[PDB]
A paper describes a structure:
β-lactamases inactivate β-lactam antibiotics by hydrolyzing and “opening” their signature β-lactam ring. Here we report structural and computational studies of Class A β-lactamase PenP with Glu166Tyr mutation that analyze the interactions between this critical water molecule, termed WAT_Nu, and other components of the active site during a full cycle of hydrolysis. In summary, by analyzing the reaction intermediates observed in the active site of a Class A β-lactamase hydrolyzing a β-lactam substrate, our study has uncovered critical features within the active site that coordinate and activate the water molecule for hydrolysis.
We set out to capture structures for in crystallo deacylation reaction intermediate by transferring cephaloridine-soaked Glu166Tyr crystals into cephaloridine-free buffer for 1, 3 or 6 seconds and then flash-freezing for x-ray data collection. Under this new conformation, WAT_Nu re-establishes hydrogen bond with Ser70 and is positioned within ~2.3 Å away from the carbonyl carbon of ES*on the right trajectory for nucleophilic attack. In this “attack” conformation, the Bürgi–Dunitz (BD) angle of the approaching trajectory, i.e. defined as the WAT_Nu-C-O angle, is ~100°. Unexpectedly, for the other Glu166Tyr molecule in the asymmetric unit, an alternative conformation with the carbonyl of ES* tilted almost 90° upward and away from the amide group of Ala237 of the oxyanion hole. In this “tilted” conformation, WAT_Nu forms a strong hydrogen bond directly with the carbonyl oxygen of ES* across a short distance of only ~2.3 Å, locking itself into a conformation not suitable for nucleophilic attack. In summary, our QM/MM results suggest that the “attack” conformation is catalytically competent with favorable potential energy profile that matches experimental data. In contrast, the “tilted” conformation with strong hydrogen bond between WAT_Nu and the tilted carbonyl oxygen is not catalytically competent.
Residue numbers in the entry: 31 to 57, 59 to 83, 86 to 238, 240 to 252, 254 to 293
The structure:
Amino acid sequence: DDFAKLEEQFDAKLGIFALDTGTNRTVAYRPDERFAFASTIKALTVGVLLQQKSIEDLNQRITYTRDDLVNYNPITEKHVDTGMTLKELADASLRYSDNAAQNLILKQIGGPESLKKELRKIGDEVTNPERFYPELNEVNPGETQDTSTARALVTSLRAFALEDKLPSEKRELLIDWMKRNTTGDALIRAGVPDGWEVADKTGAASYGTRNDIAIIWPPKGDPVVLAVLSSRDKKDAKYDDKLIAEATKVVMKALNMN
Ligand SMILES: CC1=C(C(=O)O)N[C@@H]([C@@H](C=O)NC(=O)Cc2cccs2)SC1
């Protein structure tokens, strides 16, 4: 009941799945409960992009205009005049959660419907991409569009980053981007001792949805893959990062890593 206690303290619903890739030991709490995936989808999106292109092909330059910019464009809003390469867009999407970058990448891989088809091909029957930004943040309780589960996001992040859905050079690019994420310092990273390498992707959406998916490398040992998803009862609810940090501390204890 440490997970239950956190739902009580933060008045939120929590979805946890963690897999120690070294022992196949698992920590779960509502692991199959749907949540809006929010920006966590960006990680899986770069997965599919990497699978479909050579590394050299990421050097294709994408021209775009103000009309491709949406509600949060911290990198893309600076380079309308020059455009950005696919590699630069992958960096913006993963490290800054640039929503226009995600939309431009989605367009290059054939849109939300194409992304869905490529996720089913890697064995993910759960994650349901259907819309672009900004609409994908808008998910009402009980709806399944743009939702996933903690178990499915772990299984899929692991498949791309650590297994055989990508060749080693592409896994390395994806892991490196996620390792240098700038948006995650208050979430999973804040539940993990300084010095352990962490790769993560955050998200936030309606109903106070607040998510983080990560790979954690304990000093030595095989890594852990973790999803912490959360949501609240009201549409305009605020979230609290500290719920994710605290849930992460619980996982690390339950796995005897701290
Ligand atoms: C703060 C934030 C993140 C993140 O932390 O990863 N990613 C982008 C996106 C996906 O989560 N969120 C939105 O665009 C919708 C919003 C929810 C709360 C503020 S904006 S923009 C909002």
